[PDB]
Write a protein that binds this ligand. Sequence first.
Ligand code: Z80
Ligand code: Z80
Ligand code: Z80
Ligand code: Z80
Ligand code: Z80
Lengths: 307, 307, 307, 307, 307
Amino acid sequence: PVDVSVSIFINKIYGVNTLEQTYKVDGYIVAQWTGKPRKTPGDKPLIVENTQIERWINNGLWVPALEFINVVGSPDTGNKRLMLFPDGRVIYNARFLGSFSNDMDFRLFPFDRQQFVLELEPFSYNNQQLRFSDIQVYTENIDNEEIDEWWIRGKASTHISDIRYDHLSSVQPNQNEFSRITVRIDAVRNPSYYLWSFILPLGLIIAASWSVFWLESFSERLQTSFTLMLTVVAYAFYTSNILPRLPYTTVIDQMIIAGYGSIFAAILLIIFAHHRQANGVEDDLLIQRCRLAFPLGFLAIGCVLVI
Amino acid sequence: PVDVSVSIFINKIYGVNTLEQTYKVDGYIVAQWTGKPRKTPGDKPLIVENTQIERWINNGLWVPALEFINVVGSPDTGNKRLMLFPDGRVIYNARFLGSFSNDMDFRLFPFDRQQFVLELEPFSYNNQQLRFSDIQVYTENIDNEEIDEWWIRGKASTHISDIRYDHLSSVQPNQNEFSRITVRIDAVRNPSYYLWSFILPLGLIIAASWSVFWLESFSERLQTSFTLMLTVVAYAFYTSNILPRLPYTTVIDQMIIAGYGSIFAAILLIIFAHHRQANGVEDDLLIQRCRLAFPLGFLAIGCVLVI
Amino acid sequence: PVDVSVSIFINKIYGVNTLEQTYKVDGYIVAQWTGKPRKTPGDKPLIVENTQIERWINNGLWVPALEFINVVGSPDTGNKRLMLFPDGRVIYNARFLGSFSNDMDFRLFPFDRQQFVLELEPFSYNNQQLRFSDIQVYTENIDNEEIDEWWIRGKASTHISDIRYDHLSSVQPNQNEFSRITVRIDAVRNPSYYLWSFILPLGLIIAASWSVFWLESFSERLQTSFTLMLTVVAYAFYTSNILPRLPYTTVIDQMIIAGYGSIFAAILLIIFAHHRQANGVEDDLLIQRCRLAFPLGFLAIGCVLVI
Amino acid sequence: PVDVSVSIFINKIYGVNTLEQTYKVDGYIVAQWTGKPRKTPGDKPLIVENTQIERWINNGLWVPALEFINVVGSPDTGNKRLMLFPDGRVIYNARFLGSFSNDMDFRLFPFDRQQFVLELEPFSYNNQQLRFSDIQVYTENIDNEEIDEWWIRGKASTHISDIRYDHLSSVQPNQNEFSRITVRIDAVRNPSYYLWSFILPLGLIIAASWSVFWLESFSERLQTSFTLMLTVVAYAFYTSNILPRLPYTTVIDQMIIAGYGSIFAAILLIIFAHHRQANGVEDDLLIQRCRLAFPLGFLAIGCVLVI
Amino acid sequence: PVDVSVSIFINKIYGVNTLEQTYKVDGYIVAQWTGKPRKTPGDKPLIVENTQIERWINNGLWVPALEFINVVGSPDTGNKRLMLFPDGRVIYNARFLGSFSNDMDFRLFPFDRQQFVLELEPFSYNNQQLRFSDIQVYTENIDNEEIDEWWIRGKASTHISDIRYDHLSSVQPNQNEFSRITVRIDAVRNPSYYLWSFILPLGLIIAASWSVFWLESFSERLQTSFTLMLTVVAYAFYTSNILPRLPYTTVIDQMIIAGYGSIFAAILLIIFAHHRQANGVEDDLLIQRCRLAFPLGFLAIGCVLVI
Ligand SMILES: CN(C)CCCN1c2ccccc2Sc2ccc(Cl)cc21
Ligand SMILES: CN(C)CCCN1c2ccccc2Sc2ccc(Cl)cc21
Ligand SMILES: CN(C)CCCN1c2ccccc2Sc2ccc(Cl)cc21
Ligand SMILES: CN(C)CCCN1c2ccccc2Sc2ccc(Cl)cc21
Ligand SMILES: CN(C)CCCN1c2ccccc2Sc2ccc(Cl)cc21
């Protein structure tokens, strides 16, 4: 029941695809497993590069297809070598680049925590078993990830479990448990750019929205409101175009509704102030001095968005 | 004849293409059919991975080409294996990723019901027949599909029918009926994001449009109208850019015309109010008090849009 | 001088590319031609699927390369089979998906008439001749093409002509005429979506533009004009972003200039009204009552855009 | 020292990539060169299609690799044939589609002159020499290029030169001259669409900008200015989004700055008019009658942009 | 311990991908290494083109797989030849196009200094050693790079170092040092287009923002502010859409915050001017004459953004 040692060097993780829940991984994979000893030229181990490998299989060299359970489409394989040893053991080494899939919650958008994952498992073997898994990452955190998009927290999570697959296990009675290496890296989104360039501007916009109450007239107040309305729609548009498209509301996306909200609530007061009066036309004395009472009400409702 | 058993494990459905009427499906396919018994090493069934399979065909191993009738372009095949059994039976197992086509009506956009479908059929065989079809999906609904885009309703629809193909059936008299497995999964779009972030803001915009009638002057009313106009045009643009492009009007797209409508009707009234008078310049008393009569008229017309 | 029968099943026409003048076609092609009789296993015709076909050629099986003259780049071939008959005749069957090119005039944009075309011709043979061509489409019109983008008018146009190629016809004296099947289907664009959601809103915008003359002041008129100006620029952008990019002006594109025009003509009038006076400041009495004279002038010039 | 005749049929030039300085070319290439006579079946020349060609090379048929020096990435080769003649001569014929590179100055954008270029050269041969080059283009100009994007001026420019490659010419002393066919077609951009739909609207915008001086007040002038400001930014965005992205300023891009300019110069005057006075508040009499002095000043500076 | 000479011809560097930190490089690679002498036809060196090379490997011709350590995904290889010499030495020559990765700091965006790099290293060999590296670039700077995007500063940096790889060096005790050629060219972004068409317009916008203080009223000042607000949001959008997307703030991106700032600071002043009074309503005399005190304060804070 073959023992297989696996090592995965991760070179670069890039291009998140928020809608598809998808990321790209470039790196090498290495499998080691000891076979029947053989004679090599010299006694030095034998090297078999790329195209040559497939020919060695046509002569009965077994090389297991190791599948990336969670890759979306067969990955781009760059170079591959076999290292055949005189004492039997064999090393398969190949570089890959593949688009991998995992579940990703983006609802806390500018302040994400995500988990990038690889799942390796032999494509047709249940008593060939993944001996031990080792993943080599060569980075540093908190660090250069002001230049880089993501903040890794954890380093090394491994598994190597056994997967059941209870469907048509009578195709082969008593044996359908496959050996699955699971590799998972934890990361945090860098919430600088989105605060410094999206969160902040929007707040100023919502803030300046409230300054509508310090207009003297009523016509001034109500008309200016419509320009504030336009300003949010504009800023909603600006937000939407640049930010990652999703099927749920982000934090930013909520704040944008909060904008749409405060402004439309203003409209109501501004008008109800005019027509809650003792005569025909008296702006209600205290009410249009919600000047420093809208900011508080918004900020009060903006601390229950948090919990 | 030949009886062929088929099993389809569905791993992921993603990336709908509204314009092309197209979706992406990643999963495995398994075919099983019993052939002439053979001698395998040991008596254990024989495994043939990838490249090696094509070599076994050059020696007369028949392996039927199974086509995805409704795939748009040949799909990306990841790994494939044969399981040759000593008692004859043979198992073909391969992972696929393909862009599939089906008829898709998107006119009720934020509230979709769709039917994602696979059609499998042998490419050159009419008395080789699909024994039984089984589809293995491992998800759950209503559930995580707040994080996920779609709500699956039904589970398992299968068919396995016979297709006629009456065109040049004299090429082979009396026999042109092909065995077609049909798999179809029903799903609903998650109308959360689009209401909370598109439907709602637009309504607030259309609502605030009506507040034009609570402006005192006429110059105020008519001028402000044009800013509302801009506001919709802006919001139409924002809508268009982010939402899926189509060749028909969505529900949202209608509401956007309702905006364009209410605003241009306002302009007419606002102007007709001014010059339907007893003197030269008397704004018609009751009419500019369609303040709470446009909302009713719009909401009345917005309850016949439903039926 | 070989006779070749051809049949083309068209499965889907999708993804027009206005700029490249390009469309995608998925379907099957079938070629039939009678050769020297042979012994088949049994007397049943022999089936040769995909990879195996190329092996049969290495043994002297001639299979002519049929080129798609008007495909842009080698197409995606899905599955291919040979049907070798004991009485000699041979059937080549393969599914294709390819991006095809044809001349396409889009100047009458939302009201297009287009002609989608396939051109087949052997790549190196002049006395091998296309016997007869048959095209199988299974759709219906006027019908589902409210859900579908295009209205097919004609059904079936075929040709099968002879092409000259007078360039280096001394490379082979007296024989350079190639047999070319030409298939062309006529279709009309579905002018619903673009009217109900683009043409109409623009008209309402342009109409409301004229309501500038019903502003009492002159400052009101001239200032409001600039908001109308902005309104068009906004709507031009909205138009441009969503509509298919082209190297000529569409019908919609003309209407957008008419906006830019009337508004700038308004500016001129609005200002010329002010300073064509008997005193220093008398708005010219009749002129700013081009209220229901601009609409007429615009509509008159919009009936010579048609002829 | 082999003489090679080449002919290049050009089918379509499309999809310019302004940023990458890149265009797509679909067409056929044919190479002819006389070799040692051979026996063909019959005495008719022998045809070798596609896959069969590579097999004929495995038996010592020499077919020179002809490289497209200026293709960006190996091109899509569709079909290839050999025509082996009994008297020796051999014809290589293949269809290609490739993305080609050349230097492209787009600074005079809507009024471009460009030169689309092919460079062919053997990949490993210096005394195999390109006998003569012939290029077959089948179009017409000035003509259909209102429907088409470009105006070809010249027809056929050819070269066929000798390239030195003085770097490691001691790898092979005295002989490093490669034979390079160079083909270049001159073309002009069709400056209709960009004038009728971009240049013109912007001028109207800039023109109407000057009508700010015909506003009576000062508050009217300065406030309206900011709306003009907004109008240009709007039009700049619309411009930028639709027009080809570049690393330099186009003509349009300059005109867009001219808008930004006149409007900000207006602001200065409008304000300087107010406070260059004899009392506290007297708008300077002659200056705000730069009404027909800004258009002149702009038009004067717009005649030195030309030379 | 094989000595290998390498030469790298760089044909084109294009298509920077700011987000992925990635650029495209088209060029040729040449490897030379002296092997066991052999008999060639004639005594002229032997040429082996493309497909033929792989056949020569099946007969024991060793040709080392040279990997591009920093290429993202296996690169597009166009043409490859071997030049086998009678005296043993062998030349591998092939054209490549690949997307290469390197660390790229874009925080000083319109004024970048970047370093485009190739890292070559054998895929499975430690005592086969890269003798010397030579890179051939044929361009010129400062020059055509007004038409071109980038300014190369340095010419030629080479290395050829030894890499440790201390992980599973017991897989082969005492020998895990690989020979790595490193090539790096230094380049600067062309800060013309981004100043003349983005930086400049924005300054005029921020400048004209300050002219809000020269409005006579308070209602005039506060209302106009909101139009300025809209103006920036518009210009941020225009910027964001066209400029390269990043996960940090560019210089331009900061200037956009400065706009958002000055305008929101204006609003406070404008309002605090109104309500810092001796009576109920006296605009504070000196304060709304921060007319030429906001420009100084902004420029003062705009000289500490630099250091
Ligand atoms: C500051 N450093 C964390 C930069 C690393 C960025 N990069 C990355 C990108 C997107 C999501 C997750 C990651 S983690 C990671 C792990 C290994 C390597 Cl080699 C690269 C990465
Ligand atoms: C929330 N969970 C129901 C996930 C559903 C996502 N996914 C999907 C995507 C777009 C349209 C329809 C579907 S249905 C479906 C059926 C089976 C599987 Cl395995 C995945 C999917
Ligand atoms: C309901 N009907 C409109 C269906 C036709 C749609 N489809 C199509 C699309 C774009 C342009 C032209 C066509 S024609 C056509 C011909 C054959 C087939 Cl199989 C499909 C199509
Ligand atoms: C009006 N007809 C000259 C069509 C022009 C289109 N076309 C083209 C497109 C972009 C850049 C350059 C050219 S030139 C050219 C040369 C040969 C052929 Cl076959 C087509 C073209
Ligand atoms: C103006 N001329 C220096 C052209 C430089 C353009 N190109 C380039 C593009 C983007 C980033 C860096 C470079 S450097 C370079 C080095 C060699 C060659 Cl062949 C082309 C380039």
